[PDB]
Design a protein around this ligand. Structure first.
Ligand SMILES: Nc1nc2c(ncn2[C@@H]2O[C@H](COP(=O)(O)OP(=O)(O)OP(=O)(O)O)[C@@H](O)[C@H]2O)c(=O)[nH]1
Ligand SMILES: Nc1ncnc2c1ncn2[C@@H]1O[C@H](COP(=O)(O)OP(=O)(O)CP(=O)(O)O)[C@@H](O)[C@H]1O
Ligand SMILES: Nc1nc2c(ncn2[C@@H]2O[C@H](COP(=O)(O)OP(=O)(O)O)[C@@H](O)[C@H]2O)c(=O)[nH]1
Ligand SMILES: Nc1nc(NCc2ccc3c(c2)OCO3)cc(-c2cccc3[nH]ccc23)n1
Ligand SMILES: Nc1nc(NCc2ccc3c(c2)OCO3)cc(-c2cccc3[nH]ccc23)n1
Ligand SMILES: Nc1nc(NCc2ccc3c(c2)OCO3)cc(-c2cccc3[nH]ccc23)n1
Ligand SMILES: [Ca+2]
Ligand SMILES: [Ca+2]
Ligand SMILES: [Mg+2]
Ligand SMILES: [Mg+2]
Ligand SMILES: [Mg+2]
Lengths: 439, 62, 422, 320
């Protein structure tokens, strides 16, 4: 058994963490007090779920997780909510004053005063691991803390755990649910600073999750609770292989091996189906072929982009529920004969397929319907670079006028860091073009 | 098409399907960078407070 | 605990301050004795932003009351909510400032400023986590203008990383007490340019035109103008005073609203300005209408750097988004193309007293240069003949200081013009 | 009002479309980089498709299909024809063609050594002249239909509009772009038919018809009088079949049905007609201009079927 440590940074990271850990508890049969009656080994064990939960002598199953925000208001809800008993207080770290949507305040000014405490609490968890694999880091691109503190933290984890894999779950900014003009600055600044420290990063565009909630869950104005429950379904699909018995993606290293041949091009596109409303009173259940087909519709992607106009470097399919290989292979043959799936020449054209028999779990009284089978596709396609283009365009528009730059300079960041990060983004777009397109 | 590396357990199975074959920073550096930023902050604060001390001296002259 | 410290200086500042406190005290269910008699925990959930908790389970405004003359603070103490203020927070001299910025800033005011700062420090010291300061004052008189900007300068010196926000009533010849108002206003704007993060330009010209033209009041009093000011201020502090979706402090708001440090002067607006319930299209159209703006400036003569819209009441967020998008898409040329997504929307479920639905508007528009041009012209018309200068040089000011203030304000105008043509 | 932006200053067709849209009251033109547009009239080169469809509350439409370049370049068209089973190497309605670079079909084409006249493009019978010319090598149609009066070659331009729903609309007016020199088997003036090339190097530029352009009414009259058939029966059935087969081939690759932004595009198909009244595809142009006389009508059709269909205000086409 090999442990995974989850780190939730800033508002978005903390609330998504809440949704994920709630869902993991329901999937593993762990109650809000931490007891797991199905676990017959009291106070220890080397089961697959112990990759994410440790055990006390009293039978309490404790997430291997640290929550970190620079203001206290979001983590206090965890401290007083349904799962308050799940987490030890030393796992929940708050400052007094936040980064005000300012990367420089998160990374330099405020981050400098909490980083050692955070690394110490992380060390406390690591000392409880017998074979630490690495970290799952949850954060927004747009917040001052999610961007700047997260990048500071990633640098320090590279120093203190240089052999260990690090995965990100990153919330990409959308004007439909966000209230800040400077999110493009922070996103570009954090991606630049975190790139060579992250082995694999799953970006979730709030615009895509928003539209999925509106279209498929019939929600007029999705809230964070809706968005985070859907995101948590996708995260759970991704981590299920680390948390249950199985032979695919059983270690953090395998995500990079299977999905990332170019270390900088380490942003796989996630596509999830089916998303069905709990209120929909007549639902005809969807077959393997239909949901695997859904995997190739942009409307179901976590980032809106068009994979037909790029190239695949890797692709794999994580099924949950009633799925046998024969139906998967028939679906793939059909889709190959019907759709535009072009791989780069130096990677084989192929799918790695994982199937977990336990059906997807849903939150009782939630917005999602229980389904007999679901799938998450993780594909490394150059088309995801469209999101970088959008972000870079917005950066160029503001930076040409130096709009808002003084807030960052006044926290001690230099203007050169803006153009260094932006140059690095230009080189990233170039990498994706060279891999993905022909004259 | 070709199905390889079929693994199976009670909780599921995995496999691979091929449709076609092919064809650093130190802790010292981080500390220096953070301290340089903090020095810039301190510098801006000192410029502000110097400007305000100039204002106080003008007020006394008035 | 995100505490704000409030300061009101001079006659105008203290009257509009008082209206602000009575209005928000009513919204939070606090009576004149400081007792809570509301119906909903949301009223108390973020009460500590503006109110301290006392022993008698009393909520006391975090408010400092300053003037160089006693008159207005006796009127405050006798006013309807006057008992709610902390007695030690009344800091008043005896001399007055005679509508003279130099008296407020350099002579009479300097004698009192230390005692005002002591009370500020005593309030801040007991703050869990002071976010910053708001000041109410006029720019046309002597105490709010001269001593207020002195206070602002000292607060900046002692709390240099805290947000300083003002609600600043800008003079107009249409509603004028003395001829020297443009001098006092020009000297003050320079100070605000240097030492505030956000300044709401509340123009007595605009408040007058609203009371007269729209509200059909033939003889508007200061009370009628201050009713608009207090309702606007309530609107603009809603997003931090009541529970909801936003995790903000004055610094995050400032960072979202202020793209260049000197260009931090906002046009406020309010809708509606009658029993017919107002549809979301009607609120949206009226809040963007020149006629609802409180800094008599035509927004069609400039461009919006940033806009915040705050809606209060029970309404469809879908419908709000659709109408806000409609106004942006149909009027795209008045919003700078080089700040993407520069219109932000907040909704608070709790409406103000009496209205079912309302909207408050905060615009960072380059059209605000018109206000400063106005003042500059009135300044120059006198200063080219040195008229009334002896009132100021007799308190020790040199002509040179006036020339520099005039230059600073013409530069501010030029900066607004640079970004309007970009 | 609907709002639009213009990003290709050299498009005649869309300059006229723009002027038409303005003369409604309900469309406003914006500066080329304002993102709050309903409609982009995009540039020909490196149109930023990745930035479309991300403006809350705006339905966004663009006058180009991303990926249509595959159809509108000689090498990509040859590859698409040869490699798509719905088309196949034995397409019969496309001339035998081979990709040659200066996956190079040099030897594969050489195997077609042995009517051996070929054309290289991006005209001779010895291969060495052509392969020493550096592109695609294509079988040159040695027996073209020659109009009696003047014994002269021509080509047919058809305009085709594909809307956001992937309806394929064939404009009822085509044009024949003729030579006005006799065709000779023996000097690229009797062999070619470009509008510019005839209005310059070729002597007689207007003798038989205005601007070397003949329209369907005249050409139909000629086919009735000379060959005793119609344009519809003898030629247009084949044109419609070819256009439909080409666009149905790429539909899965480029459709905007389930995408977050919508697309339409105007295409220019160029055909050759041989002496057996067999139609051959020569060219697909992704940014065509129009013959002067038909601008007004065609551009109005674009507004009616392509733009107002998505953005409605308060038939010249045949649906294929
Ligand atoms: N999907 C999702 N996105 C969120 C959530 N909360 C905030 N965001 C997004 O995150 C961005 C704002 O970043 P925050 O996480 O709130 O900022 P922060 O990391 O807490 O840093 P501070 O500025 O110090 O508060 C915006 O783009 C929001 O759309 C959430 O719960 N779910
Ligand atoms: N295989 C072939 N057989 C006979 N004639 C041919 C031919 N290929 C091309 N031509 C002649 O050459 C002319 C121009 O060729 P082509 O279509 O490649 O030019 P082009 O790239 O400019 C497209 P357009 O000029 O219509 O915009 C055609 O009009 C036709 O008369
Ligand atoms: N809107 C408004 N303006 C006021 C009020 N009282 C005074 N003013 C304006 O403020 C200026 C006079 O300043 P004042 O506050 O009386 O001077 P001070 O008390 O010495 O600072 C003039 O422009 C007046 O029009 C008020 O209650 N409301
Ligand atoms: N960069 C920056 N920010 C400013 N205001 C916000 C802020 C407050 C506290 C901060 C901070 C930033 O950074 C950390 O502490 C003002 C200025 C400025 C400089 C020089 C001359 C000036 N005349 C008017 C303004 C100004 N410059
Ligand atoms: N209001 C305001 N803010 C400022 N911010 C900068 C800042 C940086 C780091 C900080 C900080 C503040 O606070 C603690 O750390 C500058 C100024 C200014 C104006 C006018 C003339 C001036 N000459 C020098 C300065 C100054 N004025
Ligand atoms: N700058 C700014 N904006 C405001 N409006 C609302 C808003 C909502 C969401 C936003 C946003 C702005 O910007 C990013 O997301 C109010 C204020 C204010 C000023 C002075 C004193 C104050 N006490 C409480 C509040 C406040 N200051
Ligand atoms: Ca166990
Ligand atoms: Ca005295
Ligand atoms: Mg936060
Ligand atoms: Mg007065
Ligand atoms: Mg061509």
């Amino acid at each position: 058994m090999r442990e995974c440590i989850s780190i939730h940074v800033g508002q978005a990271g903390v609330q998504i963490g809440n949704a994920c850990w709630e869902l993991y508890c329901l999937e593993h049969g762990i109650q809000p007090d931490g007891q797991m009656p199905s676990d017959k080994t009291i106070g220890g064990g080397d089961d697959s779920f112990n990759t994410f939960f440790s055990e006390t002598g009293a039978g309490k199953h404790v997430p291997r997780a640290v929550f970190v925000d620079l203001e206290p208001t979001v983590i206090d809800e965890v401290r007083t909510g349904t799962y308050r008993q799940l987490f030890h207080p030393e796992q929940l770290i708050t400052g007094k004053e936040d980064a005000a949507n300012n990367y420089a305040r998160g990374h330099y000014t405020i981050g400098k005063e909490i980083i050692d405490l955070v690394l110490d609490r992380i060390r406390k968890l690591a000392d409880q691991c017998t074979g630490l694999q690495g970290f799952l880091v949850f954060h927004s691109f747009g917040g001052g803390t999610g961007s700047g503190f997260t990048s500071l933290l990633m640098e320090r984890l590279s120093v203190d755990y240089g052999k260990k894999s690090k995965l990100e779950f990153s919330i990409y900014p959308a004007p439909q649910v966000s209230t800040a003009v400077v999110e493009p600055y922070n996103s570009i600044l954090t991606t630049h600073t975190t790139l060579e420290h992250s082995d694999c990063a799953f970006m979730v565009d709030n615009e895509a999750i928003y539209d999925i909630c509106r279209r498929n869950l019939d929600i007029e104005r999705p809230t964070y609770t809706n968005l985070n429950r859907l995101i948590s379904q996708i995260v759970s699909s991704i981590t299920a292989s680390l948390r249950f018995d199985g032979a695919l993606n059983v270690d953090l290293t395998e995500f990079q091996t299977n999905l990332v041949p170019y270390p900088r091009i380490h942003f796989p596109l996630a596509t999830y189906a089916p998303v069905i409303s709990a209120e929909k009173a007549y639902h005809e259940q969807l077959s393997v072929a239909e949901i695997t087909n859904a995997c190739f519709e942009p409307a179901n992607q976590m980032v809106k982009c068009d994979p037909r106009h790029g190239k695949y470097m890797a692709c794999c399919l994580l099924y949950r529920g009633d799925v046998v290989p024969k139906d998967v292979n028939a679906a793939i043959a059909t889709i190959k004969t019907k759709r535009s799936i072009q791989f780069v020449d130096w990677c084989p054209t192929g799918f790695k397929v994982g199937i977990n028999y336990q059906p997807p779990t849903v939150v009782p009284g939630g917005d999602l319907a229980k389904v007999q089978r679901a799938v998450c596709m993780l594909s490394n396609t150059t088309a995801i670079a469209e999101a970088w283009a959008r972000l870079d365009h917005k950066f160029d528009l503001m930076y040409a006028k130096r709009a808002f730059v003084h807030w960052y300079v006044g926290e001690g960041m230099e203007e050169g860091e803006f153009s260094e990060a932006r140059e690095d983004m230009a080189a990233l777009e170039k990498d994706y073009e060279e891999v993905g397109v022909d004259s | 098409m070709e199905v390889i590396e079929l693994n199976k357990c009670t909780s599921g199975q995995s496999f691979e399907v091929i449709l076609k074959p092919p064809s650093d920073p130190s802790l010292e550096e981080i500390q220096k960078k953070l301290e340089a930023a903090e020095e810039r902050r301190k510098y801006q604060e000192a410029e502000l407070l110097k400007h305000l001390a100039e204002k106080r001296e003008h007020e006394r002259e008035v | 605990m995100r505490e704000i410290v409030h300061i009101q200086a001079g006659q105008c500042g203290n009257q509009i301050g008082a209206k602000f406190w009575e209005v928000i005290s009513d919204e939070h269910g606090i009576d004149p004795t400081g007792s809570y008699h509301g119906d909903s925990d949301l009223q108390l959930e973020r009460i500590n932003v503006y109110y301290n908790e006392a022993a008698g389970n009393k909520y006391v405004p975090r408010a400092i009351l300053v003037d160089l003359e006693p008159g207005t603070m006796d009127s405050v103490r006798s006013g309807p909510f006057g008992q709610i203020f902390r007695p030690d927070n009344f800091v008043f001299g005896q001399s007055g400032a005679g509508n003279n910025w130099a008296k407020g800033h350099y002579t009479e005011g300097a004698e009192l400023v230390d005692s005002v700062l002591d009370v500020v420090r005593k309030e801040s010291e007991s703050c869990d986590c002071l976010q910053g300061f708001q000041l109410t004052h006029s720019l046309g008189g002597g105490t709010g203008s001269g001593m207020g900007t002195l206070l602002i300068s000292k607060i900046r010196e002692e709390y240099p990383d805290r947000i300083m926000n003002t609600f600043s009533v800008v003079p107009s010849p249409k509603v004028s007490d003395t001829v020297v108002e443009p001098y006092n206003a020009t000297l003050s704007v320079h100070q605000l340019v240097e030492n505030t993060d956000e300044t709401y330009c509340i123009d007595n010209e605009a408040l007058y035109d609203i009371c007269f033209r729209t509200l059909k009041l033939t003889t508007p009093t200061y009370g009628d103008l201050n009713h608009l000011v207090s309702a606007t201020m309530s609107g603009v502090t809603t997003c931090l005073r009541f529970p909801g979706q936003l995790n903000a402090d004055l610094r995050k708001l400032a960072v979202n609203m202020v793209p260049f440090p000197r260009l931090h002067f906002f046009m406020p607006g309010f809708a509606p300005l009658q029993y017919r319930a107002l549809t979301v299209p009607e609120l949206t159209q009226q809040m963007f209408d020149a006629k609802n703006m409180m800094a008599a400036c035509d927004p069609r003569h400039g461009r919006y750097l940033t806009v915040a819209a705050v809606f209060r009441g029970r309404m469809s967020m879908k419908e709000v988004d659709e109408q806000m998008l409609n106004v942006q898409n149909k009027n795209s040329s008045y919003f700078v193309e080089w700040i993407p997504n520069n219109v932000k929307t907040a909704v608070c479920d709790i409406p103000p007293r009496g209205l079912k639905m309302s909207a408050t508007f905060i615009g960072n528009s380059t059209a605000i240069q018109e206000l400063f041009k106005r003042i500059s012209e009135q300044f120059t018309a006198m200063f080219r003949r040195k008229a009334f200068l002896h009132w100021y040089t007799g308190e020790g000011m040199d002509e040179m200081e006036f020339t520099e203030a005039e230059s600073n304000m013409n530069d501010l105008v030029s900066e607004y013009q640079q970004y309007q043509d970009a | 009002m609907y709002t639009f932006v213009v990003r290709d200053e050299n498009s005649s067709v869309y300059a006229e479309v723009s002027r038409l849209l303005l003369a409604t009251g309900q469309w406003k033109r914006l500066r080329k980089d304002n993102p709050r547009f309903n409609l982009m009239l995009g540039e020909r080169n490196r149109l930023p498709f990745g930035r479309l469809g991300h403006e809350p509350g705006l339905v966004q439409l663009v006058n180009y299909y991303r990926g249509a370049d595959k159809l509108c370049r000689k090498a990509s068209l040859v590859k698409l024809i040869k490699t798509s089973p719905e088309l196949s190497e034995s397409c019969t309605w496309f001339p035998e063609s081979y990709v040659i670079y200066p996956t190079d079909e040099r030897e594969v084409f050489l195997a077609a050594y042995n009517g051996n006249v070929w054309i290289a493009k991006s005209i001779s019978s010895e291969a060495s002249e052509l392969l020493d010319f550096i592109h695609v090598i294509q079988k040159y149609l040695e027996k073209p239909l020659l109009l009696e009066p003047g014994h002269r070659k021509f080509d047919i331009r058809s305009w085709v509009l594909v809307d956001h729903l992937y309806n394929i609309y064939l404009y009822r007016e085509g044009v024949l772009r003729t030579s006005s020199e006799p065709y000779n088997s023996a000097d690229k003036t009797c062999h070619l038919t470009n509008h510019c090339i005839q209005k310059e190097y070729s002597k007689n530029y207007g003798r038989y018809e205005e601007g070397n352009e003949m329209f369907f009414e005249e050409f139909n009259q000629y086919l009735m009088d000379a060959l005793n058939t119609t344009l519809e029966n003898s030629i247009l059935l084949q044109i419609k079949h070819i256009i439909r087969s080409c666009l149905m081939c790429i539909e899965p690759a480029i459709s905007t049905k389930h995408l977050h932004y919508q697309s339409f595009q105007l295409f220019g198909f160029d055909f050759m007609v041989d002496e057996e009244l067999k139609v051959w595809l020569i060219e697909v142009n992704g940014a065509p201009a129009c013959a002067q006389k038909l601008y007004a009508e065609l551009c109005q059709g674009i507004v009616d079927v392509a733009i107002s269909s998505v953005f409605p205000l308060a038939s010249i086409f045949i649906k294929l």
